[PDB]
Design a protein around this motif. Structure first.
Motif, PDB file in Angstrom:
ATOM      1  N   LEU A   1       5.541  32.576  36.057  1.00  0.00           N
ATOM      2  CA  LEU A   1       4.296  32.763  36.781  1.00  0.00           C
ATOM      3  C   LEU A   1       3.190  31.858  36.325  1.00  0.00           C
ATOM      4  N   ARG A   2       2.546  31.209  37.298  1.00  0.00           N
ATOM      5  CA  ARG A   2       1.480  30.288  37.136  1.00  0.00           C
ATOM      6  C   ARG A   2       0.187  30.964  37.640  1.00  0.00           C
ATOM      7  N   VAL A   3      -0.790  31.036  36.737  1.00  0.00           N
ATOM      8  CA  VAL A   3      -2.051  31.712  37.038  1.00  0.00           C
ATOM      9  C   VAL A   3      -3.208  30.735  37.203  1.00  0.00           C
ATOM     10  N   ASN A   4      -3.818  30.680  38.378  1.00  0.00           N
ATOM     11  CA  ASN A   4      -4.911  29.782  38.685  1.00  0.00           C
ATOM     12  C   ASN A   4      -4.604  28.372  38.244  1.00  0.00           C
ATOM     13  N   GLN A   5      -3.539  27.781  38.790  1.00  0.00           N
ATOM     14  CA  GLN A   5      -3.192  26.443  38.371  1.00  0.00           C
ATOM     15  C   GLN A   5      -3.238  25.661  39.704  1.00  0.00           C
ATOM     16  N   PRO A   6      -3.167  24.353  39.605  1.00  0.00           N
ATOM     17  CA  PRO A   6      -3.055  23.484  40.755  1.00  0.00           C
ATOM     18  C   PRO A   6      -1.828  23.811  41.553  1.00  0.00           C
ATOM     19  N   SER A   7      -1.908  23.644  42.862  1.00  0.00           N
ATOM     20  CA  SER A   7      -0.736  23.952  43.705  1.00  0.00           C
ATOM     21  C   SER A   7      -0.937  23.148  44.956  1.00  0.00           C
ATOM     22  N   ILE A   8      -0.030  23.271  45.942  1.00  0.00           N
ATOM     23  CA  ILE A   8      -0.195  22.590  47.234  1.00  0.00           C
ATOM     24  C   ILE A   8      -1.252  23.272  48.094  1.00  0.00           C
ATOM     25  N   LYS A   9      -1.771  24.392  47.697  1.00  0.00           N
ATOM     26  CA  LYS A   9      -2.825  25.097  48.404  1.00  0.00           C
ATOM     27  C   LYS A   9      -4.027  25.178  47.479  1.00  0.00           C
ATOM     28  N   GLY A  10      -4.221  24.265  46.519  1.00  0.00           N
ATOM     29  CA  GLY A  10      -5.391  24.431  45.629  1.00  0.00           C
ATOM     30  C   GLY A  10      -5.136  25.293  44.401  1.00  0.00           C
ATOM     31  N   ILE A  11      -6.181  25.655  43.682  1.00  0.00           N
ATOM     32  CA  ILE A  11      -6.066  26.484  42.463  1.00  0.00           C
ATOM     33  C   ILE A  11      -5.554  27.858  42.835  1.00  0.00           C
ATOM     34  N   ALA A  12      -4.396  28.303  42.308  1.00  0.00           N
ATOM     35  CA  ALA A  12      -3.857  29.546  42.835  1.00  0.00           C
ATOM     36  C   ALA A  12      -2.914  30.186  41.833  1.00  0.00           C
ATOM     37  N   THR A  13      -2.413  31.326  42.231  1.00  0.00           N
ATOM     38  CA  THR A  13      -1.455  32.076  41.383  1.00  0.00           C
ATOM     39  C   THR A  13      -0.201  32.234  42.231  1.00  0.00           C
ATOM     40  N   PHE A  14       0.931  31.829  41.594  1.00  0.00           N
ATOM     41  CA  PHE A  14       2.181  31.735  42.319  1.00  0.00           C
ATOM     42  C   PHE A  14       3.328  31.813  41.331  1.00  0.00           C
ATOM     43  N   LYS A  15       4.451  32.220  41.837  1.00  0.00           N
ATOM     44  CA  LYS A  15       5.650  32.264  40.994  1.00  0.00           C
ATOM     45  C   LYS A  15       6.354  30.906  41.026  1.00  0.00           C
ATOM     46  N   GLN A  16       7.076  30.620  39.928  1.00  0.00           N
ATOM     47  CA  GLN A  16       7.979  29.453  39.998  1.00  0.00           C
ATOM     48  C   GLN A  16       9.402  30.002  39.847  1.00  0.00           C
ATOM     49  N   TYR A  17      10.357  29.500  40.562  1.00  0.00           N
ATOM     50  CA  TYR A  17      11.765  29.828  40.478  1.00  0.00           C
ATOM     51  C   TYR A  17      12.552  28.648  39.887  1.00  0.00           C
ATOM     52  N   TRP A  18      13.494  28.947  39.021  1.00  0.00           N
ATOM     53  CA  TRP A  18      14.204  28.040  38.136  1.00  0.00           C
ATOM     54  C   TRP A  18      15.712  28.247  38.243  1.00  0.00           C
ATOM     55  N   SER A  19      16.490  27.192  38.338  1.00  0.00           N
ATOM     56  CA  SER A  19      17.875  27.066  38.035  1.00  0.00           C
ATOM     57  C   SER A  19      17.985  25.926  37.075  1.00  0.00           C
ATOM     58  N   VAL A  20      18.457  26.165  35.851  1.00  0.00           N
ATOM     59  CA  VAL A  20      18.452  25.053  34.869  1.00  0.00           C
ATOM     60  C   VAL A  20      19.892  24.960  34.353  1.00  0.00           C
ATOM     61  N   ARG A  21      20.485  23.760  34.511  1.00  0.00           N
ATOM     62  CA  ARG A  21      21.844  23.494  34.111  1.00  0.00           C
ATOM     63  C   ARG A  21      22.012  23.711  32.570  1.00  0.00           C
ATOM     64  N   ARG A  22      23.194  24.187  32.158  1.00  0.00           N
ATOM     65  CA  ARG A  22      23.407  24.430  30.719  1.00  0.00           C
ATOM     66  C   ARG A  22      23.633  23.102  30.002  1.00  0.00           C
ATOM     67  N   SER A  23      24.200  22.106  30.682  1.00  0.00           N
ATOM     68  CA  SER A  23      24.294  20.830  29.951  1.00  0.00           C
ATOM     69  C   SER A  23      23.766  19.714  30.870  1.00  0.00           C
ATOM     70  N   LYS A  24      23.122  18.745  30.243  1.00  0.00           N
ATOM     71  CA  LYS A  24      22.429  17.675  30.964  1.00  0.00           C
ATOM     72  C   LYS A  24      23.363  16.908  31.915  1.00  0.00           C
ATOM     73  N   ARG A  25      22.881  16.450  33.058  1.00  0.00           N
ATOM     74  CA  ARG A  25      23.622  15.433  33.801  1.00  0.00           C
ATOM     75  C   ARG A  25      22.546  14.676  34.622  1.00  0.00           C
ATOM     76  N   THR A  26      22.847  13.399  34.967  1.00  0.00           N
ATOM     77  CA  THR A  26      21.823  12.622  35.711  1.00  0.00           C
ATOM     78  C   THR A  26      22.358  12.029  36.988  1.00  0.00           C
TER      79      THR A  26
END
Ligand SMILES: O[C@@H]1[C@@H](O)[C@H](O[C@@H]2CO[C@@H](O[C@@H]3CO[C@H](O)[C@H](O)[C@H]3O)[C@H](O)[C@H]2O)OC[C@H]1O
Length: 207
Positions: A128-153
């Motif tokens: 959760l991001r509280v009063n941060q920059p966003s595509i709609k201005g300063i706001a509060t919004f959730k961030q959703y994450w999928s993060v790989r267990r091992s690096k790849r490029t």
């Protein structure tokens, strides 16, 4: 094709965006199709991306199957993410499908689940991001994450497969605002050359 301050446009079919807050500098070079290079120095937060911006009327299900083929030479000098990123609105959500990172694997929260897809396993997180920059201005919004267990490029990221896993876990999504292959730097310097980046919507490479 050289971009060194905040800018949103379309280049060679792809919607590109350079965004940074104040401090340090960055350079983005717009190459053919979805490709681009990025260089950043002493930034606070910088993001470089090429993909598609949508008009906020369609769920991801209505847009269709999203899939991205990419290849990047990624050389962060500190904290940075090589990922698929984007937004939904109503609700307002920023999301991240992270394939590689610098020195710190994000996003520092407790996993809510996993999804095994595209040859790897990803931990799923919600922050959760509280009063941060966003595509709609300063706001509060959730961030959703999928993060790989091992690096790849390089490889294929089945975006819609992560979107279904998130909504399965109760992380709901709104109307699509964007999907894009993204390089993000945070409190750091580095470079990245995204030499391959094709977005496919229902099988068809973007147009
Ligand atoms: O002119 C407006 C742009 O300034 C605006 O830029 C978005 C601002 O917010 C960024 O996201 C934040 C930083 O990166 C991670 O998501 C942070 O967690 C978010 O706080 C967006 O990436 C920029 O695109 O967008 C709309 C445009 O009209």
């Amino acid at each position: 094709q050289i971009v060194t301050d905040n800018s949103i446009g379309n280049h060679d079919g792809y919607d590109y965006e350079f965004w940074k807050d104040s401090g340090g500098s960055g350079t983005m070079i717009l190459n053919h199709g979805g490709t681009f290079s990025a260089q950043w120095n002493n930034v606070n937060n910088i993001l470089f991306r090429k993909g598609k911006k949508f008009n906020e009327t369609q769920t991801h299900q209505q847009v269709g199957n999203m899939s991205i083929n990419y290849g990047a030479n990624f050389q962060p000098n500190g904290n940075a993410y090589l990922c698929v990123y984007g937004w939904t609105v109503d609700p307002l959500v920023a999301y991240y499908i992270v394939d590689s990172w610098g020195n710190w694997r994000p996003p520092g929260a407790t996993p809510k689940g996993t999804i095994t897809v595209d040859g790897g396993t990803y931990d799923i997180y919600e922050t959760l991001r509280v009063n941060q920059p966003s595509i709609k201005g300063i706001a509060t919004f959730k961030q959703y994450w999928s993060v790989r267990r091992s690096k790849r490029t390089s490889g294929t990221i089945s975006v819609s497969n992560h979107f279904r896993a998130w909504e399965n876990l109760g992380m709901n999504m709104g109307k699509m605002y964007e999907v894009a292959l993204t390089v993000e730097g945070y409190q750091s310097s580095g470079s990245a050359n995204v030499y391959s980046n094709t977005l496919r919507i229902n099988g068809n490479p973007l147009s």
